[PDB]
Design a protein around this ligand. Structure first.
Ligand SMILES: CCC[C@H](N)C(=O)O
Ligand SMILES: CCC[C@H](N)C(=O)O
Lengths: 360, 360
């Protein structure tokens, strides 16, 4: 029973850690544009289809190897996806594209109990991302784990709002208010990172890449043992929930100050502790091609009292320390450029614990 | 400027390919015994001084001719050493012996920049091996290349640990742990194949045939433009590094799973990609008189994305293909019996590229 994880904090025993090798800038299509900060459009426009800066990839490779050494030191068994050249152009009857990477296991895999679920994805450059993880998943399957792949979308034009106000407009907030994003409700789609686990309760957010159809598929697939709840935040470009509402312990959550939860009272009524982390100190000149600066709160819990946090983000380190949580500092400044922190770069396969309710 | 090669992967333009003609089983002296698997001792005991099985040599001859045809097809200029009868018994004031062959150019010649260096060797049956390559080397010299011959040893008894636990003992690992092998530090000796190039950095291994004196001679001869680093692996019978740690691209290396590098962290810290190939599928009944089964990873790169790999070794072919490296399959099953794969059977004289650092 290699697979067994019910939440984000029980004693970590096994984890999968992504790879920065052969990562490619994704073609600049509507859904990529919707996620990209104006500051990087020219980069995407000129680099699409080519590898991310190799000198940069080399620094990320080194940073992740160290993180892996540290995880092993902390007693965690580490598995890595297979190396793949993401520049291969593939063609389905609906579209043609080059790949992205297998840097973020959290984006595509989620473990609920003894079951590993592969998310369908919503980006054309991520259609075949599951190929990097099949060697690991087949091994767990041979060893007794449940293996599920949610319905893979066609990703035909109909899935995208070709006329979304990507070009900047901010009333994306207005559409967002209506739960309307770059992805339509044409077919189910979602990134696993839009779901965060707390035992019997899983919280999901409708985002640029996760539609209500996708959430309903998860809800229906997991019922009645698990309850999937939808929550929303003030955010004009949501993609993944773990840098917005990161649950770090039973009844404790890190809420991004810039992205308040519309349903925060549900948690306050449940006796939950909402902690708002201090702002990130990452320089504005450092390239974050795929995300915001909020990767600082994208921490990974080794257990309730041990957290893997960025070495450079001292303010948030102090915060954890005042709470009695031991900080294991690792530097992943260059890996952050690819779009993720510790929670994103990993997928907890096995945590020592049982299925419980923390919402009463 | 016919000669110019700084690493193992730049676009190959000219190469020297060995010959299987007139190869002789070397006399069974201490240093040969140290390299030979128990399984073949009787063969060496009865065959020493005589030609390797001619029916077998004929199949190897055919295989290498095809490999040469393929190289020419791929646009590589091929040079071949002169045919020589290796059975001639020669006598120096220190010893008497018959020769081996000129099958492996990698064993005796190494190109660093515009300079071709002839290794001194450590085997008595290989003292006069350089004679097969002089016609080629003089031509390059007449055309502007630098030509260097490292100090040729006396190969007197003092060079060999006459009481090495060859007979099987495995604590060779213990001596090996101490950097102690069948060759002493009496005088400099080395096979060029114990060095592997990565631009400004050259990695060397102290082995059964390459002593620290030999490595220091190389280090001192090449400084300050090149840095020669010593690295070690878990291996009780090392002889040549290219089937243990084969560098296939800038910051990418094939590490033999059975022979881990004690200094692997230096490479992980440099952001290098360490790939461990799958195991060889060569039948145990096929004779490999001079090496292990690991010749499968002894590949030759035509460039960063084209690799010459064995036709029979499908698992490693798949590995390269998933990495986006085009596989040029050639069968050299019988040539393997002589002790080498593609990297061993050749010596890259000219690769299109410049001197660079890949270790930062
Ligand atoms: C984990 C990344 C979360 C979000 N897409 C952000 O940029 O903050
Ligand atoms: C190139 C041959 C390497 C080594 N002597 C072996 O037998 O693996």
């Amino acid at each position: 029973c290699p697979v067994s994880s019910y939440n984000e904090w029980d004693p970590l025993e096994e984890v999968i850690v992504g790879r920065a090798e052969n990562a490619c800038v994704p073609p600049f299509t509507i859904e990529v544009k919707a996620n990209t900060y104006e500051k990087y459009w020219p980069f995407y426009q000129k680099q699409g289809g080519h590898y991310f800066p190799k000198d940069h990839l080399k620094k990320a490779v080194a940073e992740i190897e160290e993180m892996c050494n540290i995880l092993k030191t902390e007693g965690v068994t580490v598995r890595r996806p297979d190396p793949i050249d993401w520049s291969l152009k593939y063609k389905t009857p609906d579209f043609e594209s080059t790949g992205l990477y297998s840097a973020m296991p959290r984006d595509i895999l989620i473990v609920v109990g003894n079951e590993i679920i592969e998310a369908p994805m919503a980006w054309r450059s991520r259609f075949f991302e599951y190929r990097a993880y099949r060697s690991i998943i087949k091994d767990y399957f041979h060893r007794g784990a449940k293996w599920t792949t949610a319905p893979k979308p066609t990703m035909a034009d109909e899935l995208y709002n070709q006329d979304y106000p990507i070009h900047s407009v901010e009333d994306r907030h207005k559409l967002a208010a209506q739960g309307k994003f770059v992805t339509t409700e044409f077919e189910p789609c979602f990134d696993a990172a839009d779901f965060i686990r707390a035992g019997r309760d899983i919280f999901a957010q409708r985002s640029q890449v996760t539609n209500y159809l996708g959430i309903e598929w998860m809800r229906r697939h997991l019922a009645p043992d698990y309850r999937v709840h939808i929550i929303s935040f003030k955010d004009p470009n949501p993609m993944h929930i773990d840098a917005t509402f990161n649950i770090i312990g039973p009844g404790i959550v890190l809420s991004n100050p810039d992205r308040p939860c519309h349903q925060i009272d549900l948690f306050k009524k449940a006796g939950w502790t909402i902690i708002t982390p201090p702002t990130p100190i990452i320089p504005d000149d450092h390239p974050l091609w795929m995300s915001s600066k909020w990767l600082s709160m994208n921490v990974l819990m080794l257990d309730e009292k041990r957290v893997m946090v960025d070495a450079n983000e001292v303010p948030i380190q102090k915060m954890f320390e005042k709470l009695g949580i031991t900080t294991i500092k690792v530097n992943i400044r260059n890996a952050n450029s690819l779009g993720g922190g510790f929670h994103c770069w990993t997928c907890d396969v096995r945590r020592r614990g049982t299925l419980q309710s923390y919402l009463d």
